Each structure stands twice: as structure tokens, then as C-alpha cells.
Design a protein around this ligand. Structure first.
Ligand SMILES: [Cl-]
Ligand SMILES: [Cl-]
Ligand SMILES: [Cl-]
Ligand SMILES: [Cl-]
Ligand SMILES: [Cl-]
Ligand SMILES: [Cl-]
Ligand SMILES: [Zn+2]
Ligand SMILES: [Zn+2]
Ligand SMILES: [Zn+2]
Ligand SMILES: [Zn+2]
Ligand SMILES: [Zn+2]
Ligand SMILES: [Zn+2]
Lengths: 126, 126, 126, 126, 126, 126
């Protein structure tokens, strides 16, 4: 994909990180496949949870949200790419790799990273 | 959907309007359904067209691009909402209505608009 | 595909051209992929429009109708073939090419045609 | 659906019955859902079978072909309607009912018929 | 797929054969594709049929049930594999081959079998 | 669903728990929707991981595996039911609820459980 489009994806993930409500870290994620956004996600508590403030074991990471949206989508996550504001944790990394995510782009930085690479997911900081 | 999420959608459509190459008008569109972005689009020439500069009868409107992406998606466009930077032309309006697009949000302004309403699509400027 | 099947497709597009209500031109279209019809379409006004008579800027071309049906389908339009009674206009041509339509078959005849070819869509009159 | 559209469906099933190669009976079927054809089928031997002539236990009924195409489609057969040139046999009837086919339209005539009705599928001769 | 997984599939088909109500033969089937079960099925009468006891011409074979479930699924049956407790009859065989079923595994044993092979479906007893 | 079918689901989840390689706990999960299994899963390391032995932070829970398979499926996880051999952990619970899983059935037993209930997922031990 051309350079300026790559950046538009990352900035979108950034747009969505700011929707989140966590004071510790705001994270956004975007799934892209075949020239199309398929899912977005940010970090926080599940829809219909009581407390909005996050750190709480029941808040989902941005990548978890995107992934769950893909599970309710009709479109496969396999072969897609993940644009995230942050490098993913080890728990998101396992799932991303098993999901057939081709590559992860992150803006902000580390175990998650080397495991993704071990497992054949490509990684690029931008 | 909460107010600040509505705005994040419009700003995303704006992010994508700026990817376009037309000097007359830069337009972005975003399809949203069930809390998820499903397609994006901007105005310009078809992939693999020779001249990048647009006005040329062969440039697609942002809404046409989003729509075509929905046609290659596995996910239905019916019941979704369109966030566009601009009010749509009459040609996009016909298709949006026939596609079962529930509502169109636009930032920038007019026949397209009243026809969408005639045809039962909701409209809101934001 | 065998010759007589090709013809059955064109005759079906013809069956549907005659459902239309336009006095100027009756057009039918049929999307085929992997041995299966996926969509059909004819020219006319959008469902729930007041006047049935078409020429009016709010009537959709047969190809626009088929395309919109594909957008509400779960099945991708990419790699399919279009059987139309008529050569498509430039506006339908842009969309057909961007949709990944592999080839267009038409019965009745011209800018749309050369652009489709420029853009890598195959074309055959039958 | 309007009357003349109903007829266009039946005539399409008829277009496809004539593609078949069986000397005993030529049958066509068409699946329709939400204003769109999703599958077609006719009676005959499986793709890549040696003898084209049918009666042979290895020829599929038109309804079996349509059904198998639906199984390879991404679009559900549930809630669709079947237009067939002929009333279906008991073996097709079982499957049609279990498939959630809403209604069957046939042109030409009888156990299959009453079972479809027992099982809550609607039936109409046209 | 590893050996012990193959067996887990067959045992699942066996789990489901025992749900059936036929005194003559209890059959189970399982569709597998890309490491995932997509459908299951057993032999018996259609949902909402009056008599539960089967032999009756209106009972579906396990393979017919799985196939019908695939037709109501969004996921294609093409390229999948069938695990059945029994070798399939000729009527199921025609459909399995036309469905693009890659291979059939059966536990219990014969025309269906050679036709599947004629038609390019692989077969293995286990 | 009838009682004996409920049990066949749980026994299938059990069939798959035994495929796993973890010495601490073997877990199986099964997704069911509209009378059809859509996904299965067990606990362990990601495909292509080096060490098969699990406890390791890079092993996925059975529910995580099923969920990831749903993300690569064309079929939505929303409105489905989860049969698991075990009550789910808090991390699986968040995701299950956000996924629109209607109800979870487990065989073996506790925070995950009350949160699922807080969040409107039904729960039943069997
Ligand atoms: Cl999915
Ligand atoms: Cl589509
Ligand atoms: Cl679509
Ligand atoms: Cl299917
Ligand atoms: Cl289907
Ligand atoms: Cl999915
Ligand atoms: Zn994480
Ligand atoms: Zn426009
Ligand atoms: Zn046109
Ligand atoms: Zn029949
Ligand atoms: Zn059989
Ligand atoms: Zn867990």
C-alpha cells in the first residue's frame, strides 16, 4: 500500500485510542484487509459493564475488541493486518498469531513483539 | 451511539478525504454497522488507471468506492450508516437508498439530500 | 463455460430487461460467479420511489442494481462476470472495474467499453 | 413480489431446464431471496462424470443442484423461495423443508407436495 | 492433520450417530474445513415431522443433514472434508462430489464409494 | 434443544479437551448456533510454536481458540452458545460477553462466572 495510506490507518487507530476511558493507557486498533478497514477497537470495559473506569481485570485491550468484532463479522481475520497505537501484550500476541494476522504495525513500543515474530507474523514500527 | 464516537467516525472520513488527489473536492466516506467500520472510500480514479489527476468522468465518488468495497465484502451494506465529509450527489443518493443504508451523516453541504429523505434514508449534518 | 450456458445467461438478462418500465431503453444485468447467478438487475427507479416512469436522474441502470444487490449479499462480486443486454455507460464501467468484475458480456452496443479494457476487464459481444 | 416478476423467475427456471441433457425430463430450479436470485440448477450428471446421458442413479435433480450451490455459497438458503419447473420428488422435498425454504413455486405437476405442506413449506402452482 | 485429531472427528460423528432414532441404522456425519467443524448431522426425520420413527422415504441421511446445514451456513462446503460413521449411499455421494467435498473418511462400510472416487473425491476407511 | 443433544455437545467438548497437551488442565470448547457446531477449541500453544508443553503465558485457552476460529469463520459468534468442559477464566469471560455469546454451559467449576452473569450471558452447569 502507498506510504500515506499506511499513515492514514495509524492515525485512525489513534482517533479511536482517544475514545477510550483508561487513564493509564489509551490504545486503538484497526483491522485492514484487501484495501478495506474491517474492524476497530479500543481499550476499556465491556458494553453494559457498570464502572466505566479501567488496572481492572475486566477491561479488554484494543486488539481484543477488534478481534471480537471480527468474530461477529462475516469477513475472515485471516490474511489481514493490524494497525495498533501500541505494541501488543503477550495475550493479544498469541491470538493475533493464531488468527492468521499477516502483519502488525505499531506506533508506540516487548515480549509480545518477539513472539509474533517467532510465530511468523511480520512487525513494523511507524 | 455516544456523541464522541459519532465524531470519531466523521473525523475518520476526513482522514480519508485527504488521501484523495482531486484538486476540486476531497471527499471521504465510512460505512458503519453494528459498532464496526466496514468500508472506507475517497474520491478518485480507479486502481490501475493511468492519470491520477481527476472533472474527469472516470473518477469515482467516495460513496461509490465504499459501496464497491461493500460489494466485495462478505458483510451486507443493508442497515448500515454512511459517514461522509460531503452531502452526496444524486447518483450516489440513488444507490445509497437502494442499498438499504439506514442513515447518512455529512459534515459539508442539495437534491441528493431531499431524495434520500423521500426514499426513507435519514439524514443529519454534524 | 459451455456455449449454450453462456447464452442462457444472456437470455436471462433479457428476461429481466423486460421487467423494467423505461420507454427509452430496457436493460437487464446478471452477475455470475463459480457457476452460479448471484444477482440480477434492471433499469428503473428505486424501490419506494413515487413515479415509476423513468430521462430522470434518479433511475438506476441495470448494472447499478446488480451491484447494489451484491453489496447486500454475503458473496463477493470480485472475480465474477457480468452479463448485460447492453454495453455499459462510463459510470457503470468505473464501478464494474473497481468491483473486480473479471469480464463483461453484452448483447447490444462505446466509451464504457474501451475504459473497461484499459482497466483490465475483459469484454465480449454475443 | 409483483406478478410479472414472479413469472420472470419461472421463465428463468425454464431457461435452465433446457440446458439439461435428460430425455425423460428437463427440470430447472431457481433460488430467490430478498429480491435476488442466489442459485440455479438443472437435472443431470455431476461435473466431470463420464456419460452425459441420464434413469441413472447418479443424476442430480435440479433442486439438488441448486441446494448444493447454496452450500458452496456464503448466503443462507433459509427464508428463500424455490422456483422450479416441476413439483419436487419426495427426496428433494425433505431437503427443501429442512433447508428452511419458505415456499416452492412450480409450473408442472404428488407426495413431495403434501409433505412440503405438512412440514410448513408453502406451495403454489403457476 | 495429526492422527489423534482425525480420530476425535470420527468419534464426534459417532457421538452424533447415537442421537438418531432409527432402529435400522444410526449414522453421524461431521464437516471439517480449515481446522474447524462447520456442520454435524445424523439420520432421521425432518424437524417438525410427526412420527419420530424412521424405512420411511422422508428420513434424511446424516450427510443430507450436514449438507443442508451447510446451505444455511455462511461458510462454503467446497474444500471441506466429511467424517461419517458410514460409507455414503449413491444419493449422498452425488451431492458430496458436486459440493466440492475434498475427501470422505468413514468408519463402517459400496457403489457410493467408487463413484466418489470416479468423481475425484478421496476416500479413507479408519 | 432436547436434553440428549445438550449432552452430546458437552461430550464433544470433552472429546476435544483430550487432544490438548497440558498436564495441568485439559479443556475443550464448542460453539453452537442454530443447531450447528461452528467451532471447537482446546487449550495449548499456537500452531507452529516450538515447545508443545504448556504455566506458559503463550498457551491459549480453549475458549480463546474457539473465538479465534470464529474470527476466521464467515459465521457470526453473536447469539451462539458455548459448551466448555470448564468454567471460563476472567479473560475468556470478558471476550465471551463482548462476543454476544448468549449462554455458556460448563461441566467443571469462579469470578469468570459472576461476571458473565453481570454482563447478561446466561450460565448453566451440567
Ligand atoms: Cl465470524
Ligand atoms: Cl458482497
Ligand atoms: Cl456484501
Ligand atoms: Cl454455505
Ligand atoms: Cl450457504
Ligand atoms: Cl469472521
Ligand atoms: Zn494486549
Ligand atoms: Zn456522488
Ligand atoms: Zn450505466
Ligand atoms: Zn427430486
Ligand atoms: Zn445416503
Ligand atoms: Zn480462560
Amino acid at each position: 500500500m502507498k506510504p500515506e495510506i499506511k499513515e492514514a490507518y495509524m492515525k485512525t487507530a489513534e482517533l479511536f485510542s482517544q475514545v477510550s476511558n483508561c487513564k493509564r493507557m489509551k490504545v486503538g486498533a484497526i483491522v485492514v484487509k484487501n484495501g478495506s478497514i474491517l474492524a476497530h477497537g479500543w481499550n476499556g470495559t465491556p458494553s453494559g459493564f457498570h464502572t466505566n473506569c479501567c488496572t481492572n481485570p475486566f477491561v479488554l485491550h484494543a486488539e481484543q475488541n477488534a478481534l471480537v468484532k471480527m468474530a461477529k463479522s462475516s469477513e475472515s481475520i485471516d490474511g489481514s493486518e493490524l494497525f495498533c497505537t501500541h505494541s501488543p501484550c503477550p495475550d493479544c500476541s498469541k491470538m493475533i498469531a493464531q488468527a492468521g494476522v499477516k502483519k502488525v504495525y505499531y506506533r508506540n513500543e516487548t515480549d509480545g513483539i518477539d513472539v509474533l515474530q517467532q510465530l511468523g507474523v511480520e512487525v513494523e514500527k511507524m
